[PDB]
Amino acid sequence: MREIVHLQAGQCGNQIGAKFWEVISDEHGIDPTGTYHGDSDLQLERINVYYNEATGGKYVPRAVLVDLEPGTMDSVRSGPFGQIFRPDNFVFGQSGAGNNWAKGHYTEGAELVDSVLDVVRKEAESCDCLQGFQLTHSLGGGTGSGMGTLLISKIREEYPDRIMNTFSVVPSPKVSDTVVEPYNATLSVHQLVENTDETYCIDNEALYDICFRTLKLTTPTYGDLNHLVSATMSGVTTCLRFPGQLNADLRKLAVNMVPFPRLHFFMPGFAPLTSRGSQQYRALTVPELTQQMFDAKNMMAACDPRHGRYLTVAAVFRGRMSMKEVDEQMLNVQNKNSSYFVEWIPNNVKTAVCDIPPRGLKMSATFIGNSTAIQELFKRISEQFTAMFRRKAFLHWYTGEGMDEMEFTEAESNMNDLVSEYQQYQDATAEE
Amino acid sequence: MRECISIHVGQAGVQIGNACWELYCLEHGIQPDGQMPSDKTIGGGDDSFNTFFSETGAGKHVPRAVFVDLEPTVVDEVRTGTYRQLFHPEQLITGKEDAANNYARGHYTIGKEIVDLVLDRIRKLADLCTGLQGFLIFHSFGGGTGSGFASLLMERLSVDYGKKSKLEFAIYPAPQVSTAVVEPYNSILTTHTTLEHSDCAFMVDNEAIYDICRRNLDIERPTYTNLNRLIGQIVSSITASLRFDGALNVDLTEFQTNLVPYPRIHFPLATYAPVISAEKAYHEQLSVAEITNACFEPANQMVKCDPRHGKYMACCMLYRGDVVPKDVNAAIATIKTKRTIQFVDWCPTGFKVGINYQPPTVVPGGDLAKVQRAVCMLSNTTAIAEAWARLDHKFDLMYAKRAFVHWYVGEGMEEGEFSEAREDLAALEKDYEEVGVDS
Amino acid sequence: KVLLEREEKQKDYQARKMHYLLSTKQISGIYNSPFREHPDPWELRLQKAK
């Protein structure tokens, strides 16, 4: 029935996908062997969304791992849950991307792409009817950004009537990993705005700041980031995995949340982010959660939403509390903080409560909203791209592949158009 | 898979390869016999040794490297060593005549005699492998064997394999101290070949090694062994994510793609740390920020150049050992706001994150102590262009009266080779100056 | 005609800057290629005086 096909790309994408799979297995009660060790009721009925029915009750994962380097599959397979996946899906090449988008898209994106199209087509045909495809990758390298866009384009061309949601990692000038990262980001944003339904922004620096100043961890590492993003996606996906009173799906969000197709970016966030010693001293209530979902300290942004106006907001809850509190909190927020959202469109916050609490935690609530906080990222990316493209540095590598330079020109023209559009929609005046 | 072939030309190249191979065998627990005799007490070795070594049907390891030299004395010196049972005699090609700091003979009358043999050797070695990424060519600019032969062989390897990385590692004639006199004669001709026919070139000298050893290791009696040990540690750190894994693996291609802003400018500045002795590694708290800041100090650079004279365009950051990302982020935040460090007005940021879970090991009898983590830096700055300027000035002053030129004339080579080499170096220096100039 | 001379002068200071953008080394550059020609009225200017 209604299932979701999951896709993998990039080493960071691979590790975050593996962490998400481990988290969902632990919360739904799946042993590392592959059988079922759960003790719940809703963990059997709708369990087929991410699994597949097989003999002996041994559910199998549904996620295709696509990469160019064989060293990632060895690492992810040696983990405690790396023996449960399908080795056939581990389609890896012989040559690395070298953090090159053009080279990875041209050379390592021609003779290897056929296998992954074949396997994803087989997986789609294996089920009766589908909804959408989830791909978790990063823009930091020629692996995630290099072929994730191509795969999304191919699946959109083949199956237009599907959901294209992704959680790509946005770069940051303060925290970099690639010298040519602005080039790859500029190339990827064009595909993200041309052939993608929706996209969520992911920043490592903001999560590092969040954990350092709130969680107060001794040695924060990428594992913590993977845990947080896995919890984020789990809260996002619990609307369909565990139906409650007011259930929702991805497509209703994507329609109600995106006013214009050219602006499909969002802002995720999770509410209960506390230190280890503060877990035994907390008051579980609605106003605290509302403050932590509204404040800029808890969101995972490397930016400030207060510089602009809120466009569209969805409050997705997961627990057993009430319905009146949410609406009254939203009403008094819109009445008091009237200068932080668009006055032209009232009621910009959506109510959504999942009656099924998560495993291991009683109260959980994520934040999905599209505030005016990405324009500074876009403008700084445009400025740095123009700075690099003026004297044309680090350009011989891309030119030697075969592709010309007009692609950069059209990409930057599109970015200028998009940022102009964003800035002239930020000041959405009522009238003249 | 990630498998590379090492090339060793000249005595310096051969001894460097020996140091690298012995470091690899000691770090991987590989016994000198070639098999695994540790049947009573194991001490490691269950890893991916296929990157450098090869596994036979009987449990034997065959090194994959090229040990070619003209003077048979070095081949004999290595042959009478204790590691003779590891490699194969077919890989150590002898020779009747040697260049010995001479290019013309070594490029025309000696080089062209042994070509088909080494080409067949390297073809067999490449066929023995599955995945090839780059090469490890070890030579020197002062040595005649390591200049003419290196040039003539790489000129053929480039035209035979255009899709494979061509690295470079050699020694620079220090402006203060030198071993011979005709060193710039060979250097001026080798630089053109390495610039217009290779992708990346790494340059170091010995005076800086002497200064750092007497300053930190505090040795009054230096020797070549520690010099080779430092270079071997550098090479091992560079290719650390290949033999092993980590949080963010950094392969050869991954960094070399960004290390070349322009194939004119492919001369990075390596900096190893910590370079300390045993007593220098006991009562000294070591974190990431301190060593990263020390990496930018001119005293710790292996090239005698003040970084404050120019600015940086591209930077490559590496690590090895138990490194925590928060310390890396803190160090990045510290250095990005440092006013002493200069950089161009166009590249706000650039560096890499290589996290290696395997800590660096030690050697019994060496000088390096047991450090929990290591770090290496490959930056690109225009302040290093002074070395080429001094080399050009020396060449001009020693070419005006044609000192020691009649020998090369008699050997057979066109005397213009000096003129276009000089003008190519001048144009390269002009390009470096123009790039170093901001808006 | 002095304007035309300026136009001719507008070709030489070009050779000043793009001397450092001569992308011909390694037989792998930006403007040139085995398919897109050797220095030509545009790229011939990338090699000239200071």
From Swiss-Prot, chain A:
The modification Phosphothreonine is found at T55. SUPFAM superfamilies: Tubulin C-terminal domain-like (SSF55307), Tubulin nucleotide-binding domain-like (SSF52490). One of its GO terms (cellular component) is axonemal microtubule. The modification Phosphoserine is found at S172. GO terms for biological process: flagellated sperm motility; microtubule-based process. InterPro entries: Beta-tubulin_BS (IPR013838), Beta_tubulin (IPR002453), Tub_FtsZ_C (IPR008280), Tubulin (IPR000217), Tubulin/FtsZ-like_C (IPR037103), Tubulin/FtsZ_2-layer-sand-dom (IPR018316), Tubulin/FtsZ_GTPase_sf (IPR036525), Tubulin_C (IPR023123). The modification N6-acetyllysine is found at K58. Tubulin is the major constituent of microtubules, a cylinder consisting of laterally associated linear protofilaments composed of alpha- and beta-tubulin heterodimers. Microtubules grow by the addition of GTP-tubulin dimers to the microtubule end, where a stabilizing cap forms. Below the cap, tubulin dimers are in GDP-bound state, owing to GTPase activity of alpha-tubulin. GO terms for molecular function: double-stranded RNA binding; GTP binding; GTPase activity; metal ion binding; structural constituent of cytoskeleton. A motif (MREI motif) lies at residues 1-4. The highly acidic C-terminal region may bind cations such as calcium. The MREI motif is common among all beta-tubulin isoforms and may be critical for tubulin autoregulation. Keywords: Acetylation, Cell projection, Cilium, Cytoplasm, Cytoskeleton, Flagellum, GTP-binding, Isopeptide bond, Magnesium, Metal-binding, Microtubule, Nucleotide-binding, Phosphoprotein. Its cofactor is Mg(2+). Mg(2+) binds at E69. Widely expressed. Expressed in the retina and the cochlea. Belongs to the tubulin family. The lineage of its organism: Eukaryota, Metazoa, Chordata, Craniata, Vertebrata. GTP binds at Q11, E69, S138, G142, T143, G144, N204, N226. This is Tubulin beta-4B chain. It is found in: Cytoplasm, Cytoskeleton; Cytoplasm, Cytoskeleton, Flagellum axoneme.
Swiss-Prot record, chain B:
One of its GO terms (biological process) is male germ-line stem cell population maintenance. Its EC number is 3.6.5.-. The keyword Coiled coil does not apply. The modification 3'-nitrotyrosine is found at Y83. Some glutamate residues at the C-terminus are polyglycylated, resulting in polyglycine chains on the gamma-carboxyl group. Glycylation is mainly limited to tubulin incorporated into axonemes (cilia and flagella) whereas glutamylation is prevalent in neuronal cells, centrioles, axonemes, and the mitotic spindle. Both modifications can coexist on the same protein on adjacent residues, and lowering polyglycylation levels increases polyglutamylation, and reciprocally. Cilia and flagella glycylation is required for their stability and maintenance. Flagella glycylation controls sperm motility. Some glutamate residues at the C-terminus are polyglutamylated, resulting in polyglutamate chains on the gamma-carboxyl group. Polyglutamylation plays a key role in microtubule severing by spastin (SPAST). SPAST preferentially recognizes and acts on microtubules decorated with short polyglutamate tails: severing activity by SPAST increases as the number of glutamates per tubulin rises from one to eight, but decreases beyond this glutamylation threshold. Glutamylation is also involved in cilia motility. InterPro entries: Alpha_tubulin, Tub_FtsZ_C, Tubulin, Tubulin/FtsZ-like_C, Tubulin/FtsZ_2-layer-sand-dom, Tubulin/FtsZ_GTPase_sf, Tubulin_C, Tubulin_CS. Its cofactor is Mg(2+). Mg(2+) binds at E71. Belongs to the tubulin family. This is Tubulin alpha-3 chain.
From Swiss-Prot, chain C:
It is found in: Cytoplasm. Strongly expressed in adult testis but weakly expressed in the spleen and thymus. Strongly expressed in round and elongating spermatids, and weakly or not expressed in spermatozoa. Disulfide bonds: none annotated. It comes from the Eukaryota. This is Spermatogenesis-associated protein 17. It comes from Mus musculus (Mouse). The chain holds residues 164 to 213 of 379 of the full protein.
